[PDB]
Design a binder for this molecule. Structure first.
Ligand SMILES: Nc1ncnc2c1ncn2[C@@H]1O[C@H](COP(=O)(O)OP(=O)(O)NP(=O)(O)O)[C@@H](O)[C@H]1O
Ligand SMILES: Nc1ncnc2c1ncn2[C@@H]1O[C@H](COP(=O)(O)OP(=O)(O)NP(=O)(O)O)[C@@H](O)[C@H]1O
Ligand SMILES: [Mg+2]
Ligand SMILES: [Mg+2]
Lengths: 312, 312
């Protein structure tokens, strides 16, 4: 086993986004792009210069090759991932009558059919783990990821990004109970206002954050689009304004906020459970502001294309 | 139940071929094309003006819509098909170092997961049925198609197009025994020289055709690329020369030969088991020559794009 040098290990989906493009012959085709929210977060972390790892199910096929190539060039260690001959998850996007239509091809895929046997070896040189998004909806991988979070939560820092995609949730009740169990096990929870709306809880979003801070998390961050983010602890509330940019699109911007927060806490030497329980206003602001600043670069260009440290 | 007016019912795969194209931005994308060998044969039959039906598994999703739209515009009756919410089979093609690479995404698809419950209602107004190609390799659909052939063989004319795709055959022995059982139940068998090579039998291809004419078929046709085809019965051997054309590609050309043969036999009023056992040299030549002439149009343009009668 290799020393992972105080690594942040991202655990979750890697997929191919299949997006509509125009061919030379004036016909619609689908151009493949490496993607998946947790994948994007891992890419963003690597580009910020943090020691970064990725655990997922990845195919041996040519789409799997795309994913691995992208991870490698962003310096992400994906030795943790389970490789199999199952196909790669494909996410088709179309514009139909000025409205977005989605088709999710995830049958018996490398990513979906993870088993307990596939769980990574995690020693003291992993400082933190991140979970989130659609890898937690699907089965059997969702149960594997929840099990991994529950197994490792006592040992190191846990970050959860609910990142709700309701169109893929077939039974609300069952995903909601999983979210609550996983929030209870998280040290840091980051989500958008829209994410939070899906939980259907009472009161202002500030009030709900305060309630969640009684359930396990030491830090709750609510992202607010162009408006930045607000961070909540039991000792402080820290509003962080957005950065003004010329917007191309905002897809995957939240994935970069995850990276900025974790990268800053890493740099500050605050990635321990105990350190997180004692964050100062300055330490919180620094971490969420890096997430917000980094995410602003992403929204300034097409797709989830997170910033290199040297781009900032 | 509707009168199908002496219909030829094609039974087999419908899929999306995903082919490499250049985007305006100089990037590779995959353009979707309606396809599948048995689908192509049904399209070709419809375009030749023959009453034509199609039994398959087809998705309710947007790729399924492409398939249905294509069938409708070629006047094919697909009321027989089983519609489900399972995804559509995707066949990816790439050019890697001047060599063709294939990736077949067929997990839990509309086409693959057919059951006995899905088999069509077949009455006296169906004159013939056609089977073939990769729908016979996969399970469970392959068993369903073989069962349908065995059930209907005593009642009407059976056409088999082995159309071998060895890259998708995982166990040779099991597909070979299925081919032999289905050949035994066929009135007409058409295949290429390369198809025949895969059977690994002894002697000249003329000798092997003669052996198969002792096993059930009344007509065996071997296609020979630019060289046309040779047709074999117990009463005659009929060489049919190829038509010279400017070749674009030959993909799916064999599917049009199927259509031409069946369309001619339909027009001549020879689509009964008894009529096929008594074919004259002239009747054989007419049918195979239409297949060869029609296929020549297909090879004159990109992909499996079979000719309308009014194009000939
Ligand atoms: N219009 C904008 N202008 C500047 N920054 C933006 C804009 N929209 C989003 N951002 C940045 O991106 C962060 C996250 O965006 P936000 O819309 O809250 O996440 P999200 O809805 O979860 N996006 P996604 O990753 O696609 O799920 C914000 O906190 C900002 O820092
Ligand atoms: N180079 C050519 N020139 C003219 N006609 C051709 C040419 N190639 C094929 N054809 C026609 O297409 C028929 C079938 O082609 P052939 O190559 O024998 O089938 P195949 O190998 O089974 N093709 P496919 O449908 O892709 O499996 C031939 O009998 C010809 O009538
Ligand atoms: Mg948003
Ligand atoms: Mg050929």
């Amino acid at each position: 086993h290799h020393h992972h040098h105080h690594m942040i290990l991202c655990c979750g989906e890697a997929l191919i986004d299949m997006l509509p493009r125009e061919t030379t012959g004036g016909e619609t085709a689908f151009q493949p792009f490496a993607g998946g929210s947790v994948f994007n977060t891992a890419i963003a972390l690597g580009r910020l210069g943090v020691p970064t790892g990725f655990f997922s199910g990845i195919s041996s096929d040519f789409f799997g090759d795309v994913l691995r190539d992208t991870l490698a060039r962003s310096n992400v260690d994906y030795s943790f991932a389970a490789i199999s001959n199952r196909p790669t998850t494909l996410a088709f996007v179309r514009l139909v009558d000025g409205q977005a239509r989605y088709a999710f091809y995830d049958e018996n895929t490398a990513g979906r059919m993870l088993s307990r046997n596939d769980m990574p070896y995690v020693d003291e040189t992993i400082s933190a783990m991140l979970f989130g998004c659609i890898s937690l909806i699907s089965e059997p991988c969702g149960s594997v990821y929840e099990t991994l979070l529950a197994r490792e939560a006592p040992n190191r820092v846990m970050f959860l990004d609910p990142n709700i995609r309701a169109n893929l949730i077939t039974v609300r009740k069952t995903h909601l109970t999983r979210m609550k169990r996983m929030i209870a096990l998280a040290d840091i929870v980051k989500l958008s206002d829209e994410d939070l709306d899906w939980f259907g809880e009472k009161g202002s979003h500030d009030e709900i954050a305060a309630e969640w801070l009684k359930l396990g998390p030491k830090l709750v961050v609510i992202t607010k689009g162009a408006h930045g983010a607000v961070a909540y602890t039991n000792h402080a509330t820290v509003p962080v304004p957005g950065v003004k940019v010329d917007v191309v699109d905002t897809v995957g911007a939240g994935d970069t906020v995850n990276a900025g927060i974790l990268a800053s806490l890493h740099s500050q030497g605050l990635l321990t459970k105990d350190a997180l329980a004692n964050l100062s206003e300055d330490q919180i602001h620094s971490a969420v502001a890096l997430g917000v600043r980094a995410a602003a670069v992403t929204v300034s260009r097409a797709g989830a294309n997170p910033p290199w440290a040297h781009e900032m």
